[PDB]
Amino acid sequence: MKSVMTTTISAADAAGRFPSSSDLESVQGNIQRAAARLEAAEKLASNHEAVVKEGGDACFAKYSYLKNPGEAGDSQEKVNKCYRDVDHYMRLVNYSLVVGGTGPLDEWAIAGAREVYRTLNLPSASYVAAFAFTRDRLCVPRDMSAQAGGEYVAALDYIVNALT
């Protein structure tokens, strides 16, 4: 689980070192930045159903062809799995904001995603559409503070880059 703490500790362990000054300083930054990302995580946790709905809606709005026979969303159940997937990512966004690292997204969503989506005929651009919208939907200070908004957008940009 990649975070500030686990990365520094892993580096120290690889060299067989006790935690030193640079390890301690790195953790101090985790302290400083925690408030912003925890605010973002809490806002997401309190309103994720509405956010997920908007994300999935944006996907099928942009790519209505998905509902055609033989396509990824040709049934209500398949469409439901699409919104479920968006919910999966956003919960991992919430996790990544709490952890302060892309760990939860890396291990639980991104790793092996290309193989899954390729094999199951799930166009990557459809996921991109959901999270590009989710990212661009935010504005400050309506939804959250500026630094909280920075964390929220950055985590979503991380997903979009991973998809592209």
């Binding site: 689980m1 975070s3 686990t6 500790i9 935690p19 301690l24 408030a35 919960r91 709490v98 939860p104």
Partner: protein, 177 residues
């Protein structure tokens, strides 16, 4: 490995739940006391050599048979390996204290340790003694009650930190017992 924060999301993931405000009281408290935790790690690390040496010496002075022929601290090669193990264990204990989670200690140090010690013939009770003494010294440096050195810091309560560090040492003893 996991830290205090990723441990929460691991627990929350099992229930497929978001981490919300009602789940972050302990983690916000973790951040608030963050400077004290960094001091606790610094105070242990800064006295690592003394902690390890005194504890291994303490183990031997309690069990003279270790440095007799057939003893597991007999010859410089074995004594060095024992001093090495003491330093390693304290190092992973300090890792866990920094992360606020025992996973790095469990995964990278304690996993299999009982089995290798049994295979080597490393006496487990004497190992427990060395760890127990390290706990006494390390937690004392955290608590600021070390007899020959008091680290500079604002006066306050670090009993939670010291208790946490102590529990990490206890897990070591339990893993090989």
């Amino acid at each position: 490995m996991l830290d205090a924060f990723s441990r929460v999301v691991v627990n929350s993931d099992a229930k497929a739940a978001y981490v919300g405000g009602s789940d972050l009281q302990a983690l916000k408290k973790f951040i608030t006391d963050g400077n004290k935790r960094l001091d606790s790690v610094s105070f242990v690390v800064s006295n690592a050599s003394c902690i390890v040496s005194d504890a291994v010496s303490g183990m031997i002075c309690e069990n003279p048979g270790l440095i007799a022929p057939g003893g597991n601290c007999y010859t410089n090669r074995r004594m060095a390996a024992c001093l090495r193990d003491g330093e390693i264990i304290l190092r992973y204990a300090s890792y866990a204290l920094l992360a606020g989670d025992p996973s790095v200690l469990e995964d990278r140090c304690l996993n299999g340790l009982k089995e290798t010690y049994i295979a080597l013939g490393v006496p487990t009770n004497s190992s427990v003694r060395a760890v127990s003494i390290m706990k006494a010294s390390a937690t004392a440096f955290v608590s600021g009650t070390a007899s020959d050195r008091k680290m500079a810091c604002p006066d306050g309560d670090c009993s939670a930190l010291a208790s946490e560090l102590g529990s990490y040492c206890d897990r070591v003893a339990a893993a090989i017992s």
